[PDB]
Symmetry: C3
Subunit: 95 residues, 3 copies
Amino acid sequence: SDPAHTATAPGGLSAKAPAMTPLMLDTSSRKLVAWDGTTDGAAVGILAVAADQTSTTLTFYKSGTFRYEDVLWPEAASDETKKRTAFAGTAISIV
Amino acid sequence: SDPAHTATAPGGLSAKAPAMTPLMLDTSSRKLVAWDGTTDGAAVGILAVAADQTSTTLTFYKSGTFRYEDVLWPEAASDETKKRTAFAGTAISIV
Amino acid sequence: SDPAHTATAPGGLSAKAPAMTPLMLDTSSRKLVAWDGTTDGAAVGILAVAADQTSTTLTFYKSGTFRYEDVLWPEAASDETKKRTAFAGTAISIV
């Protein structure tokens, strides 16, 4: 049914991040960074391999269905519905 | 070919919506609602399972290729081109 | 591996475009046109069949993984990172 395809892109993480972390683009450099949890519609992917500020390239999921309880959401994303639709319009969804 | 993958998310419809209805996010709650046909780029999916105002979860297509004539476009979407590219950037397209 | 799915949409090119040309929506007509290389986040597809200003329909990739070296980026897209994440959030990625 729904394949979880991976992808790679330049990383600009501020700190170490585990797999299952939502990612967004930095608006200035357009590197992948952790989603802030507060910018609506900014999530673009889910980190697939743990990484940090030294990681030049990140490996991330660009498709699939992920359980709500399995994604390591940022604490600032305090609303369950906005998390559940954080990937709407991408090939990623939340169950 | 181009399988049509489904997804689920919280719903906030105000009226009955048959399958094949384009959906957008509500800008306040970020629940899935009917695409208004007037906010450019806001369509995120196509309802897969008929639903209504009591539906708490909507089941929607997040990929696939759909015939222009089969999608139940909102009437306020009066321009054919803008309908045909309403899903550009998503995994959905119109033929 | 990650299938590259095609799509069709109304085209609005003003010049010849070979296959592998990044595409964006025209913000007035919402026809598919060449990505300018400067509007951040506007790339929505990669042309799959060469086209020109006479083409009424463009045939494009809406998913897949493409090599950075194979995509025919516009000259104005001068920053490698911004090209590499030009499709983030779509079903397309760059390797």
